[PDB]
Structure formats: C-alpha cells, structure tokens
Design a protein around this ligand. Structure first.
Ligand SMILES: Cc1ncc(COP(=O)(O)O)c(CN)c1O
Ligand SMILES: Cc1ncc(COP(=O)(O)O)c(CN)c1O
Ligand SMILES: O=C(O)CCC(=O)C(=O)O
Ligand SMILES: O=C(O)CCC(=O)C(=O)O
Lengths: 284, 283
C-alpha cells in the first residue's frame, strides 16, 4: 500500500507507525509538504517542488531543507516504486516541525497510488462552482502572517470546501475573492484560454504558485503561446476558450460546467492536455 | 507526554503512534480539544465533549462516542494526577484516520503545562491586532470555511503567533477585514465595559469559548451583566480591561495593545477569581 523513505534513505517496513502522538504535524498541522507525480520511471519536476519546499519552509520558520538529502530520499523512493509497478505514483514530501519540545524536524518521503478520481478528471473533466474565499486580493503580500503562499500540512479547510461542493454535485471549486477576482482552487491552479493566450491569476494574490502552471508557461511560450498574469474575474471565466484546474498529480481537469452553467468546448482543449504533458517532462 | 487511545491502551512513551499516512499529519484533517487538569480532574469535561461533537459535525466526522472518550480522559487524567500534583495539559486528538482507511484516529494525550502559561496568568501579555483575512459576515455567508470548527489545522494560528513574537508581542487579537474584533489565535477575547463583560458574537468566524461561556454563567450570578456585542478596536482601548481566555491559560490580561500600555482596573483583581470558579462550576 504505502511506502515510506526517511532522509537517511532506508525504506520503512509497511504497516508500522512512523510518527509520534506529539508530532506537530498531527496535533497542529505545523509543517509543509509537496506532491509529485511519478510517470514513466521518474518523479516529475523535482527541483521546482524542492524550490517551493524551500520557500514554504522559510515562510514557516522551519529549518532550511537539505536539498541533497531530499533528492536522495525521492530517488530511492522513485526507483522502489518504478520497480514495483508501471502505474503512476503519488509521491509526497512531508516536512514537519517535529515533536513538541524537541528540536529535530520531522521529514520523510511517501509514495502512494494515484486515486481513481484523477483518471476521470483528466479524461472527462470536472464540474466546478465558484465560492467566496473570504480573502481579498491584497492578502498575500500585505498580510504575510497568513502565509497564504505556503503549502502547509493544514489542509482541513481545503478538503471541507471540496466536500461542500460535492454535496451539490460539483467536482471541484474555484475560489473567488471578496473583491471579485479569481484566486485559485483548493488543490489546483486556475488557467484559462483566451484569444490564443493563456492566463492565470498574478502571484501577489493570496494563492499558491503552481509548479505545473509555471512549467506550462515555459513550454507554451516556447511554442508561440502568449502567457501573462492578469486580474481575472468571474465574467472572464465564462468567456474563455477553456478553464482548467492545474496541479501536479491531476495535471489538467477542464471545467466543462461552472456554477451549473455548461461551458462550450474548444479545439484548444485537446492540445491543452498535451501542453501540460510536455510541461511535467520539460525538466527532462 | 502520556498517551491513552480510545482503544484503551496506554502507550509506552518515546514510541511512534501514528502511521505516515494518517490524515492528521498529511492534511491536518481532524478536530481536537484542550482541557486543563486541576485538583485531580480535567476541567469542564462535558462542555469540551460537546464542542468536540460540534466540531466533528462541521467536519463530516463520525459522531464521537462520548463514553469511550470519557474513559480515555479519566484514565489519562489519573495517570497524570498519580505522577504529580502540578496541572496538566490534556488534549483529545480526533482525526479522520489513515489515508484510504476507514477507522478514525482517536487518542488522549497529557503533557506538562508550558511555562508561558504561568507568566500569562500572573503577568499578562502584550498583544497586537492583526487582520484575520476573513470578513465578519464570513461565518454565515461562507459555512464551507468551517471557521467555527476547532480543527487540527493550526498552521496559520501558530505562524501568526511567531510573527508577533518577533515584534515583542506575547499574543494576537484577530480583527476582520471589516474591522471587527474576532478572537485570538488560541484564546477568546473578553473585555470589560460599564461591571459588564463583552465578547464577540459566535456567528462571527470564531470559536465558541468553553471557558468564556462558563465565565459568563458564574459572572451573571455575581451581579455582572454579560452580553455578545460587535466590538471594534476603539472598544478595546476604551475598555476597563482585555483578557484572552482559554482552557489552559485560563485568563491572560492584555497589559499592552499595539504598543499602548493599558491601566489596571479593580476588575482585574476579580477577573482571575471568576475564571477559577468557572472551570470548576461543573463540580
Ligand atoms: C492550494 C493549491 N493551489 C494550487 C496547487 C497547484 O500546484 P501544483 O501545480 O504544484 O500541483 C495546489 C497543489 N495541489 C494547491 O494545494
Ligand atoms: C482559535 C481559538 N479560539 C478560542 C479558544 C478558547 O477556547 P476555550 O476557552 O474553550 O479553550 C482557543 C483555545 N486555544 C483557540 O485555539
Ligand atoms: O487528494 C486531494 O483531495 C488533493 C490532492 C491533490 O492535490 C490532487 O488532487 O492532485
Ligand atoms: O489550542 C488549544 O486549545 C491549546 C492552547 C490553549 O487552550 C491555551 O493556551 O489555553
């Protein structure tokens, strides 16, 4: 089922507990993490995930992550998963503040099966609803204490928002600020397609920076696509050629229905998935 | 630290309890409660198990088995009471369980009361107001944000406290973007206006304070009028006193707010006594 690789590089026995009852990841969600996709024998975009992991650790007053130590744990876990199966894997880096009163932070690497919801979201897409996030667009930089750009282990609200939309037949959520500007998804980055130009909310918004979105901008710009960071509104969502919820594991899930209103399908939608396919391998 | 799971086992300390895929650790996905052990028993057990039931309901968690929770609490309490007469910090950890699994994670943990608690009770704290990022109407207009649930996802709460620590402040008072007083990152805000006690209303995106409510009950019987009002920052500086009330710290008087020192009022002498009798009013 689940596989664990500590920073020393040894693979822990399945079915055995790793974390103590007083680890700050469990009692207070006090830590940062990253999620990587294993595809065709290798984890995708390792450096971009370790770069953001280094930034999330700085925003959380966590010890600076040892990148050579993290690269070995991911490489050991990667080769163990690829040897075990040819299916894609969900590789996650867990970096917590450690036990209460202790000094050493908790850090390990975990590979798990990719959920079945991913193959449906890639192939079929998702129905999404816009939901008030409660944050204004100024929240990321003007209010740094909210650390909205840090990918922390405190994801209880993100999961509850998804369950709220599930009870209403929605497969995902697009967060909208009190100002009326598009922010992000609870687990993905919002990218739209306008005439052909791809847009995404600007990074000074209280949102996470998408590793997949930036790599998508690199491959798309090198192929002739114009990309930019703009203040998107809900109206701009409905007039686009396509909306996608982009992330590291789900890759690209087009929003075919937004707030119950179906959105038309464009020829750019078949190339968009290929654009995200080349993005996660642009490191190779 | 001592751990007593709802299964009934007392774990040998220094041994791991949770697997690497527990949703408490990978997603902060769970609810918890913090209780104070004083004079041989945890304080306001029933009121904390009631809020645990409400936080679990907002989180689509299985309804907690209160008789099993009471056993883990009683077993963990007497193990601490047997070891020392000092106060203890008892916490109920209730998570969704392992990723992909079905059984939820549930255990009770007792630890020493931190040294910051003795100072906050005795001396008080210097606090700063900080924007919470939520509007005051956000609790009712956005129920999906489950701001009334006491979850294990306290990364923002702890980061906010560290930010104020770098500025010489001992705690924080959250203010909404609309400018209304909400709560602390780890406490409930109670102020003193003319002998009247006020606190922000619970339909705000805040937690309902078990200690604050038990305080309102004892205070009303002693002649004080208590009520829930929409407080602004001006009400903080014009008040007779500000306290950050909670289950473990009890009452932490704010002696300095945003750098401005606040005078001491005769109500400051009585307030600590009111919270002491509040947390044992169940007995
Ligand atoms: C809040 C949030 N925003 C955006 C993203 C997308 O980031 P990435 O492309 O690196 O997966 C994620 C990752 N699930 C996320 O949790
Ligand atoms: C966010 C928050 N609000 C309020 C409180 C106070 O609640 P209670 O008096 O029931 O402990 C706490 C306790 N730390 C808290 O963490
Ligand atoms: O599993 C979840 O709900 C979120 C994980 C994620 O980021 C994803 O869907 O790829
Ligand atoms: O989050 C908690 O409840 C623990 C902190 C607390 O209650 C306190 O400091 O009094």
């Amino acid at each position: 089922n689940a596989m664990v690789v500590t920073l020393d590089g040894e693979i822990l026995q399945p079915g055995m507990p790793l974390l103590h009852a007083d680890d700050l990841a469990a009692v207070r969600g006090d830590g940062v993490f990253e999620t990587l996709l294993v595809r065709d024998g290798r984890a995708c975009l390792v450096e971009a995930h370790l770069q953001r992991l280094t930034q999330s650790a700085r925003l959380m007053d966590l010890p600076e992550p040892d990148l050579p130590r993290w690269r070995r744990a991911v490489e050991v876990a990667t080769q163990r998963w690829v040897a075990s199966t040819a299916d894609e894997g969900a590789l996650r880096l867990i970096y917590s503040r450690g036990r209460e009163g202790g000094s050493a932070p908790t850090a390990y690497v975990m590979v798990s099966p990719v959920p079945a919801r991913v193959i449906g979201a890639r192939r079929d897409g998702v129905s999404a609803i816009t939901l008030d996030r409660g944050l204004p667009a100024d929240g990321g930089d003007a209010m740094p204490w909210l650390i909205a750009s840090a990918k922390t282990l405190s994801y209880a609200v993100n999961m509850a928002v998804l369950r709220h939309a599930a009870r209403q037949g929605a497969g995902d959520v697009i967060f909208v600020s009190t100002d009326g500007y598009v922010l992000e998804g609870p687990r993905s980055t919002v990218v739209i397609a306008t005439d052909p130009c791809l847009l995404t909310p600007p990074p000074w918004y209280p949102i996470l920076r998408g590793t997949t979105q930036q790599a998508l901008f690199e491959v798309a710009r090198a192929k002739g696509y114009d990309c930019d960071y703009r203040a998107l509104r809900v109206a701009d969502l409905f007039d686009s050629q396509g909306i996608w919820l982009v992330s590291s594991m789900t890759l690209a899930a087009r929003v075919h229905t937004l707030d119950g209103r179906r959105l038309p399908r464009t020829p750019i939608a078949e190339v968009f998935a290929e654009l995200v396919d080349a993005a996660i391998v642009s490191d190779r």
